[PDB]
Amino acid sequence: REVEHFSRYSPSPLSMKQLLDFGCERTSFAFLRQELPVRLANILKEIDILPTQLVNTSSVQLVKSWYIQSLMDLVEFHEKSPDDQKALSDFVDTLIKVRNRHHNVVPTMAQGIIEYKDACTVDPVTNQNLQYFLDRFYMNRISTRMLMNQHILIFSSHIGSIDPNCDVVAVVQDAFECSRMLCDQYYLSSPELKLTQVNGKFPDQPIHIVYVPSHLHHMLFELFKNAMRATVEHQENQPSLTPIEVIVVLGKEDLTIKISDRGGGVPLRIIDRLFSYFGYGLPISRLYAKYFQGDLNLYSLSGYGTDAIIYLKALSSESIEKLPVFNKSAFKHYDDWC
Amino acid sequence: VPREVEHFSRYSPSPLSMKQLLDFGSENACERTSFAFLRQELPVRLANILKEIDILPTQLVNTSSVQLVKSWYIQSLMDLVEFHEKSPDDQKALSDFVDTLIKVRNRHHNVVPTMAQGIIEYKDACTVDPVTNQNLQYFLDRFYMNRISTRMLMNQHILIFSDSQTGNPSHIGSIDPNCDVVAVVQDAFECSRMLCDQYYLSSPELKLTQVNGKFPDQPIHIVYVPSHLHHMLFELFKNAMRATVEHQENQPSLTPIEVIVVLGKEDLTIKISDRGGGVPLRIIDRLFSYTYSTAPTPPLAGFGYGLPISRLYAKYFQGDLNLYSLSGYGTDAIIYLKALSSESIEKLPVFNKSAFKHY
Ligand SMILES: Nc1ncnc2c1ncn2[C@@H]1O[C@H](COP(=O)(O)OP(=O)(O)O)[C@@H](O)[C@H]1O
Ligand SMILES: N#Cc1c[nH]c2ncccc12
Numbered sequence: 197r198e199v200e201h202f203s204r205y206s207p208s209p210l211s212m213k214q215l216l217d218f219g220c221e222r223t224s225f226a227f228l229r230q231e232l233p234v235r236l237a238n239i240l241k242e243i244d245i246l247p248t249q250l251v252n253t254s255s256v257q258l259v260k261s262w263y264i265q266s267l268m269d270l271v272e273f274h275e276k277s278p279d280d281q282k283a284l285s286d287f288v289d290t291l292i293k294v295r296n297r298h299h300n301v302v303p304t305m306a307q308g309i310i311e312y313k314d315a316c317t318v319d320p321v322t323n324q325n326l327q328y329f330l331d332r333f334y335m336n337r338i339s340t341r342m343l344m345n346q347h348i349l350i351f352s353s354h355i356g357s358i359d360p361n362c363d364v365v366a367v368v369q370d371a372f373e374c375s376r377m378l379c380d381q382y383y384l385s386s387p388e389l390k391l392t393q394v395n396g397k398f399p400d401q402p403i404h405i406v407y408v409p410s411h412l413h414h415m416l417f418e419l420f421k422n423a424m425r426a427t428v429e430h431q432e433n434q435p436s437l438t439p440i441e442v443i444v445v446l447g448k449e450d451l452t453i454k455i456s457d458r459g460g461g462v463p464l465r466i467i468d469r470l471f472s473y474f475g476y477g478l479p480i481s482r483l484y485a486k487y488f489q490g491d492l493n494l495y496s497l498s499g500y501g502t503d504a505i506i507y508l509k510a511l512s513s514e515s516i517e518k519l520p521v522f523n524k525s526a527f528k529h530y531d532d533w534c
Numbered sequence: 535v536p537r538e539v540e541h542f543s544r545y546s547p548s549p550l551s552m553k554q555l556l557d558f559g560s561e562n563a564c565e566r567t568s569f570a571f572l573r574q575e576l577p578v579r580l581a582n583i584l585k586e587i588d589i590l591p592t593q594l595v596n597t598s599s600v601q602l603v604k605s606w607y608i609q610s611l612m613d614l615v616e617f618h619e620k621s622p623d624d625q626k627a628l629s630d631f632v633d634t635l636i637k638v639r640n641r642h643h644n645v646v647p648t649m650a651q652g653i654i655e656y657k658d659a660c661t662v663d664p665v666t667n668q669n670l671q672y673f674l675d676r677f678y679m680n681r682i683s684t685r686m687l688m689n690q691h692i693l694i695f696s697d698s699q700t701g702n703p704s705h706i707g708s709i710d711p712n713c714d715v716v717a718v719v720q721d722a723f724e725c726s727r728m729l730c731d732q733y734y735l736s737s738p739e740l741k742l743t744q745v746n747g748k749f750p751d752q753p754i755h756i757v758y759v760p761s762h763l764h765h766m767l768f769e770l771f772k773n774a775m776r777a778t779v780e781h782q783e784n785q786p787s788l789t790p791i792e793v794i795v796v797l798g799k800e801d802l803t804i805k806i807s808d809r810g811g812g813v814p815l816r817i818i819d820r821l822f823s824y825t826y827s828t829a830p831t832p833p834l835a836g837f838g839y840g841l842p843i844s845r846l847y848a849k850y851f852q853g854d855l856n857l858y859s860l861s862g863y864g865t866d867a868i869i870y871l872k873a874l875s876s877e878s879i880e881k882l883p884v885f886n887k888s889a890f891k892h893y
C-alpha cells in the first residue's frame with residue numbers, strides 16, 4: 197500500500213550547496229521522513245517490472261524485503277511531531293538501522309543478476325533493460341545512502357560526508373596508494389605515480405572543490421586498480437613498469453582528472469563491456485561521477501594504453517543529484533541505420 | 535515525388551566493405567558486375583535520402599539550395615535508371631555508364647556547400663539551426679553520410695574503369711591498400727600549419743610518436759581511403775591549432791601538438807593532444823552540432839562542420855571520433871579506424887518506419 201502511494205511522488209534532487217548551507221534537525225527530519233520513502237517506493241515499483249525469474253531469486257527478494265521494511269520503518273515517523281525529542285533520536289537510530297539493513301544491498305543485487313544471467317536466456321532487449329535498471333537502482337542507493345549518512349553524521353572539518361575544501365590531489369594520492377598496496381601484494385611490483393596539476397581557475401594555487409571525498413576515492417581506486425592490473429599484465433615480460441600518469445585540472449566549470457597507463461589498451465569493440473554489469477566497480481564508479489552531474493569515460497589506444505577521465509562539477513550549486521524517477525518515460529524505456 | 539523515387543526508396547541500401555571494394559577493383563574486377571550492382575544501388579541510395587528531404591521543415595525544403603539538391607538527385611536517379619534496360623554485355627552501355635557517373639559526380643560536386651548554404655539561409659530566415667533543432671542535426675548526419683557513400687561508390691567505378699580518370703596509380707580506385715598513416719598525418723598537419731600561419735603568423739609544431747602493436751617496429755599501414763583520413767586529420771589539426779595559439783597568445787613559445795598513432799589487432803587509433811585550454815564538458819555535445827562554432831561565421835573556423843563531418847568519415851567504415859577535454863588545460867581528439875578491411879563496412883542510413891519515428 198505505502199509503496200504504491202509514495203511511488204506517486206517524484207524524488208526531490210538536492211545540490212551539494214543545499215546539503216552544505218543546510219548542514220536544523222527538525223527540518224532534516226521532516227524532509228527525510230518524506231523523501232526516503234519516496235525514493236524507496238520509486239525503485240521498488242521498478243523492481244516489479246524486471247523478468248519474473250530475476251525478481252523471484254532469493255537475492256532480489258531479500259532486497260525487496262529490506263527496502264519495503266525500511267520504507268515502513270520511515271513511514272511510521274509521519275505520525276510523530278518534529279518537536280518529539282524521542283522521535284528525533286529514534287529517527288537517527290532508525291536511519292542507522294536502515295543503513296545497517298542496506299549494508300549488503302549491492303552484492304546481494306549483483307548475486308541475483310549473476311544467478312539469473314547464468315541460468316536463464318537473456319535476449320538483447322532484456323540485457324539492455326538490466327543495464328538500465330541497475331544504473332538506476334545503484335544510483336538510487338547512492339542517493340539514499342548519501343542523504344541518510346548526512347543526517348546521521350551531523351545529528352547522531354567535513355559537513356557530514358562533504359568536505360567543503362576537498363584536497364583533490366591528496367585523494368588521488370590516497371587512492372593510488374590503496375591500489376598500490378594490493379598490486380604489490382598480488383604481483384610483487386606496482387607502477388609509480390607521476391602526478392601533475394593545473395589550476396586554471398586559480399593559477400599556482402592548490403586545487404580544492406566541494407565534494408564527497410569517499411565517492412571520489414571509490415572512483416579513483418577502481419580506475420587505478422584497473423590501470424595497474426593492465427600495466428603489470430601487459431608488461432609481464434618487462435623488467436620495470438611504466439608509471440601511471442595523472443593530471444588534475446581545475447577549470448572554471450569543471451574539475452577534470454585524467455589517468456593514463458601503457459597497459460596495452462582494449463579494442464573499441466569491447467570497451468563498452470567494461471561498463472556492463474564481480475566487475476561492478478567500473479559501472480558503479482561511473483554512477484558516483486554522474487551522481488552530481490559529473491561523468492567518467494574511458495578512451496583506449498588498443499596496443500598501447502588507456503586514458504580514463506573523471507569530470508566533476510567545480511561549483512557546488514551545479515552539483516545536483518541525478519536521480520532516477522519511475523514515471524511514464526521510465527516505463528516506456530523498458531533500424532534507421534544499416 | 536516521381537514514381538521512380540517512391541519505388542526505389544522501398545529498398546534498403548546494401549553496405550559494402552572495403553575488402554569487397556578492393557576485390558571488385560582488382561582480382562574480382564568485373565565491369566559488368568559493378569555496372570549491374572551500381573545501376574540499382576545508386577538509385578536506391580538516392581531515393582532513400584530524397585524521401586527524407588521531403589519531410590524536412592517546409593521552410594527549409596523550399597530554399598533554392600535544397601530544391602536544387604533535390605532536383606540534382608532526381609535527375610541523377612533518372613540518369614541511372616535509364617540503364618536498367620541495357621545489357622551488361624553491351625560495351626557501349628558500360629562506356630556510357632562511366633560517362634554518366636562522371637556527369638553525376640560533376641553534378642553533385644557542389645552538394646555539400648549548397649546544402650550548407652540552405653541551412654545558413656533557413657537559420658537567418660527562421661532562427662532554426664542544427665544546434666537547437668535535433669531533427670535537422672539528425673537529417674544532416676544521414677544526408678552527408680549518404681553523399682559520402684554514393685561519392686565513394688561512383689568514384690570507385692570511375693577510377694577503375696574509365697579511360698581518362700585513373701586516380702593514383704598506387705591506389706585501387708580511391709582505396710590505398712597500404713595506406714601510410716603517418717605520412718597522411720604529416721601531410722594533413724602541414725596543410726593546417728599553412729592556414730594557421732596565415733591567420734596568426736605562427737603555428738604549433740608536431741610531436742609525433744607511433745606504436746605498431748600488431749607488427750612491432752614495422753611501418754603502420756592499413757587498408758583505407760587516404761582522402762577521408764586526410765580530411766579528418768586536417769579538421770582536427772585546424773581546431774587544435776586555433777585553440778593552442780589563442781590560448782597561449784601571451785606565452786613566449788607554443789606548446790606543440792602531440793600525436794600518437796597506434797596499430798592494434800582490431801583498431802588503428804590516432805590521438806591528437808593540445809594544450810589549447812580545453813572545453814567545458816557542458817558544451818562538448820554542442821561541438822558536434824552542425825554550424826556550432828565559437829568563432830563568428832565567415833576560412834579557419836566559423837562554419838562549424840569540422841567535428842560532425844570528420845566524425846561521419848570515421849564512422850562511415852565502422853570507426854569513430856571522440857573528443858575528451860580538460861577544461862583549463864587542453865583537449866584530446868581521438869580517431870578510431872578498423873584495422874581489418876573485412877570489418878570496414880559502410881554505415882548507411884535507411885528510410886523506414888524507424889527513421890520516420892525519429893523525425
Ligand atoms: N581542440 C579543441 N580545443 C578547444 N576547442 C575546440 C577544439 N576542437 C573543437 N573545439 C570547439 O568546437 C567547436 C566546433 O568546431 P568545428 O566543428 O571544427 O567547427 P569550427 O572549427 O568552424 O568552430 C569550435 O568552435 C571550438 O569551440
Ligand atoms: N578502468 C579502466 C582501465 C584502465 N586501463 C585499462 N586497461 C584495460 C582494461 C581496463 C582498463
Ligand SMILES: [Mg+2]
Binds near residue numbers: 769773840
Ligand atoms: Mg573546425
